[PDB]
Amino acid sequence: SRMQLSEEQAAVLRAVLKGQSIFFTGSAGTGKSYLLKRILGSLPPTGTVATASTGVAACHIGGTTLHAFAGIGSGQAPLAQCVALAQRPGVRQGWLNCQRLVIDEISMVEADLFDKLEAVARAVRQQNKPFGGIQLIICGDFLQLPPVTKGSQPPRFCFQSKSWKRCVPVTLELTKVWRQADQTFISLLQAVRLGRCSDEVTRQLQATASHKVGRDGIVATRLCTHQDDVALTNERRLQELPGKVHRFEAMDSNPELASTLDAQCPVSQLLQLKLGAQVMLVKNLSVSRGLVNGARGVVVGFEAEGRGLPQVRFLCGVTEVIHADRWTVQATGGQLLSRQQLPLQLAWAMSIHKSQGMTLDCVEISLGRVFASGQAYVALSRARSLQGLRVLDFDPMAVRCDPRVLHFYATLRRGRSL
Ligand SMILES: Nc1ncnc2c1ncn2[C@@H]1O[C@H](COP(=O)(O)OP(=O)(O)NP(=O)(O)O)[C@@H](O)[C@H]1O
Ligand SMILES: [Mg+2]
């Protein structure tokens, strides 16, 4: 028995099943991605394409990246060239067979890209209708991570596309936060999302600098803005441990394409561990035991036999032997790639981009610098509880809302009751 959809979630599902192209939006942890999974379950799978803007977000819903589905290269080539790319075997069939296109984490899709995809859809499908007649089912939060670009110009938000409102004529909202159960923390997060750091909000975030977020032998994951710093931190902390290194090598269906798998999986080709290593579980092994995607633990031993698999103690108190798992990546043109590896990554540090869409419960962040719009909010809103969060050097300068996004949302609401 599925959880009970809220009335707001039910209204989105109703619209989708009526065939309406929609955008649905809501704060972090309002159940957008969960609702996509419910929508996907409710639809005939033939003709239904599940995508997200990022690899990390696509895996959450069992889908592919928007980039892989589109099959237009970077998207920076001239339109005619993108159309020709979309016409390639495997890519073309994807476009033609698509009746419904799900896109999670839309805030990272820049307007110029959306325009290109819209034009490609019409050309490949030979349908003179918005987005080639595809039913779009889009969600995300424009107050979370901002758009990225494969070019060099300042990206526009997806809603700035001249085709946005024609393509998603209806917007619905999810307004109840579920990730956090604590109303004090819910209200704090909403202040941050809107860029309203009163004296009280700042003091409450500053108070978290004293939080003990870990447990015996488990330390906080430091959320960082850039992968360089993540890598360096994880490598150095592992190097510093006195234990000998235990290695686990991935088995890929096509080892030549290990680079493409590395970019769309949360585990690496070569996993190195020691006693004491700080790790993140990156598969849902057991919701009832708390062994879920994002759970933080520490390696407490290695089995004597066989491969010498790691024993990991998690924040919840469960100690489990971590066995092999598998990922299948839906790459461009219908190609599938798989990787077998243990579902562990080092987690002294993690990038905020890689945390996108996740729930976490043992995190530290330094918020004394200018960040991208929405980026501090994403980092803070990963935590299930305020007591799993440690904010160092907080300054409201870290919390920025792009005025374009506030304007969008205000417009959206103009005719609404609340
Ligand atoms: N109707 C519901 N009742 C109870 N819990 C729910 C409901 N809908 C969603 N959840 C839970 O809400 C939590 C957050 O869901 P999630 O799908 O990650 O939200 P989201 O809006 O996609 N978050 P983000 O990607 O960070 O903006 C998950 O633990 C869900 O199980
Ligand atoms: Mg989500």
Author numbering: 203 to 620
Task: Reproduce text from the manuscript describing this model.
Pif1 is a multifunctional helicase and DNA processing enzyme that has roles in genome stability. Pif1 proteins are monomeric enzymes and members of helicase superfamily 1 (SF1), while the 5′–3′ polarity of unwinding place them in the SF1B subgroup. The hPIF1 helicase has the domain architecture characteristic of the SF1B RecD2 helicase subgroup. The overall organization of these domains is similar in all nucleotide bound and free structures determined. hPIF1 has three structural domains, two RecA-like domains 1A (residues 206–381, blue in Figure 1) and 2A (residues 382–435) and domain 2B (residues 436–548, green in Figure 1) with a SRC Homology 3 (SH3)-like fold, in addition to the small functional domain 1B within domain 1A (residues 280–300, cyan in Figure 1).
Here, we describe the first high-resolution crystal structures of hPIF1HD, including an apo structure at 1.44 Å, and a complex with the nucleotide analogue AMP-PNP at 1.13 Å. This interaction involves a significant movement of the residue and the 1A–2A inter-domain linker relative to the apo conformation. Importantly, this conformational rearrangement of the 1A–2A inter-domain linker (W380 and R381) during nucleotide binding causes a significant ∼4 Å shift of the N-terminal end of the α9 helix, which in turn induces a structural rearrangement of the 2B domain. However, a comparison of our 1.13 Å AMP-PNP structure with our 1.44 Å apo structure shows that the binding of the nucleotide induces movement of the Walker A motif (residues 228GSAGTGKS235). Consequently, loop 412–417 becomes more flexible and allows a distortion of the β-sheet β20–β19–β7–β18 and adjustment of its interactions with the hydrophobic core of domain 2A.
